[PDB]
Symmetry: D3
């Protein structure tokens, strides 16, 4: 990780290290800090699957001690452990049993694919895609004891930029 | 379907025509009465997948005019359109936008696999399996306009037997 | 087949019997007229895969004597032999080694999925998607001796509607 | 099936109605005589998978009383219920718990794929492929109570032709 | 970096298993290379079989023959080769092969990872057919490999698996 | 990568670090020298898939300063980031937007699989396999801006050996 850059021109683009593939098996891998290995954090407790590829941006630190989380809302499953350059386009704001949880929403950049050339902001994604993301994060831990999430709402790309920018600073 | 039997010794065993495969793609096929072909009824509106293989028993008719639905709680996906012989072991009772809805829970017979030899009643399944099934039927239609469901509770194998027996006689 | 309608309100929507799944195995199935069974027509001779689910609309007849073909430009693979209700949104006009070939381009209806709500015409699809579809039909038979194809251009939803209406009338 | 031909020029080529896909899930589907539907006959009792696509030739009848069995030795999985035209190239001769058992070994024809152009006899296949086929049929039933198989040996294409021709006459 | 992966939290009750082969799927026997940490293709299986569980090894363990403790995880879902998963040993399959004594731990995911196995405490809690398929697999999967062979001795219990693991942790140090 | 040998007895066998799996998803991974991580270089811009598992030989260097690239023409998909020992059996020679471009064609060794025992030279592969490989590399970048490719021709195993040998000493 120490030699994976945050991105080329962050926060406009960031590199995401993928932990969980969209769809497929309900297996929540999590990269371990100390070893760089992907551990199985858990199998999902609900009959749900990730609505996009999920991972984190290296060399970022949130207020709560974790790297910036990102849900990549493309349609193809990516290998856990790979790195993908993406455009943040928004953020999903939630409150969970552990406090404030803000997840960046991102798309692959045009160099990787031309499929998203007209997606510049989370509001350009289909409405049902946004709702599914909300509903996933709201309910995927329903059968884990003591665990809940409430959806506050969505914030725009400029907010996602600022959150990333500040997480980069907090890391240094 | 006319030459497909209800089962060998219904209601102890029944044949289920599978419409939707456990896991995999969130595509809800439904077998069309008149044509016998599998139609795409919808893609699921939530980021969920079926917690078992799902289908219906031919030549049965529930109170509200549909064949008996069965969730087969094995672990391997089955081909939509196939027929599998199963033992009912319980029923999940619910109330949705359409009124009462019973779902039979079933396992493959010992002839098909020896993996479930110690499962004789829905209560022999792991507790988390039953909760996931409840939670699935509770939430999978959450983002479909006007659709809702609540869990009433579980009923035992004898109850499922009685429910199937009723629907066979009603079909005649 | 006789019990499968052309559509609900054709040509605005049509039912497509799917022969080939998007992506996955490069196996071209074709439904046999006389038996109704899916036959293997061939394995593709090139290292390509269908860029959409592909099939035909029953009870239609083109000038050639074949049913109207449709490429459904959604992202998930559909079971060969299923039926899916779609909206035609345009047509791809081509020349084959066997004469003029017109393919309907279509999307699933909003009842099946809310994901394409703002797609009303083939020009709303991403530009790269259209180019890939052209490129696919242009090249997938390159290594089949004596077979070839050239792209003439695209026609709008109105032309597609007219093509289908004429094909429905030709069938009667 | 009553409109599916035995082949174009049998026994040189025959149509096989595929029941079990190569690899993938250990699910032995079987087409029901009186229904045409694919029933799950069983899950394999051993941790094995079919080494080719497996099915039967319609309108044939072996001395046993079931249609001729064919193992298609290509590498890509085929849809159960599909029909594929193949060249018989040999036969595997076996004895099991219910008498003599011959399996035709077959490859897809050159029309479907050019990959097997220099395969004219079962002995043209890699030796390991033939050994894997023997070993599969020898062991896949090892954990089924009262079932067993012993391999007798292989016969050539000529014998396979004669086996199929006698089975065609036997059906009539 | 295996050096920073722990044997487990409370070993031998739980251990961490670095996964090398996924259950089912492609008959591809990856093996992790000591020297590089890379997953090498050791071979494609020579028989038309597939692994009946996810298979890998416990780091920082050493058997008498110089190899780490081997574990077959008998869950139902395929795991990514090279991931790490925390499991409860619940028994051992005892075999002899061309290499000498071969004792493979059987294990299940811990309850934190999944609540599906809460009533599985020992290998004898698994369905019999599952145990017989595991025996049958190890007995036959190398049948067509030249010079390779395997004989099943039988099964041993969780306490045995614990002692085997304890002795392999001390042997590593 | 420092600890992965070029091979056991190169150039007769070489170790290949796999970047892209045969078939499956059109995701072109590439290993970063400095980090060692697999990055997504791009999604394919055409509806094509790799006709073999594709990677590079560590500690080799072409005259362009890249490692020797290898297409492994086996049939089963390999995990990106795994290492596999293969026999070079020839080379495909091409010109691209980058300049000179030689791709080694390779098969797995006999130790890994007995399936290719009679394959000693690229000419032993089926003709259609070679045509597919050429066609793939000829066209897979057709919709990438500024990118182009022309097939020069194929060269034999000895040329392959000589190419690898020169890239080995070039790295030293």
């Amino acid at each position: 990780i120490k030699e994976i850059a945050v991105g080329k021109n962050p926060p406009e683009d960031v590199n995401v290290i993928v932990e969980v593939s969209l769809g497929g098996q309900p297996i929540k891998y999590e990269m371990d800090k100390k070893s760089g290995a992907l551990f199985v954090d858990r199998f999902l407790y609900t009959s749900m699957v990730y609505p996009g590829n999920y991972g984190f941006v290296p060399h970022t630190l949130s207020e709560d001690g974790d790297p910036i989380d990102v849900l990549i809302c493309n349609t193809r499953p990516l290998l856990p452990g790979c790195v993908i350059n993406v455009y943040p386009i928004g953020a999903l704001i939630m409150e969970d049993d552990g406090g404030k949880d803000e997840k960046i929403i991102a798309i692959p950049t045009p160099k990787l694919t031309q499929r998203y050339n007209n997606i510049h902001d989370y509001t350009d994604l289909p409405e049902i895609t946004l709702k599914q993301i909300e509903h996933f994060f709201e309910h995927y831990k329903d059968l884990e004891p003591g665990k809940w999430a409430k959806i506050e709402g969505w914030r725009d790309k400029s907010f996602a930029h600022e959150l990333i920018k500040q997480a980069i600073e907090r890391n240094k």
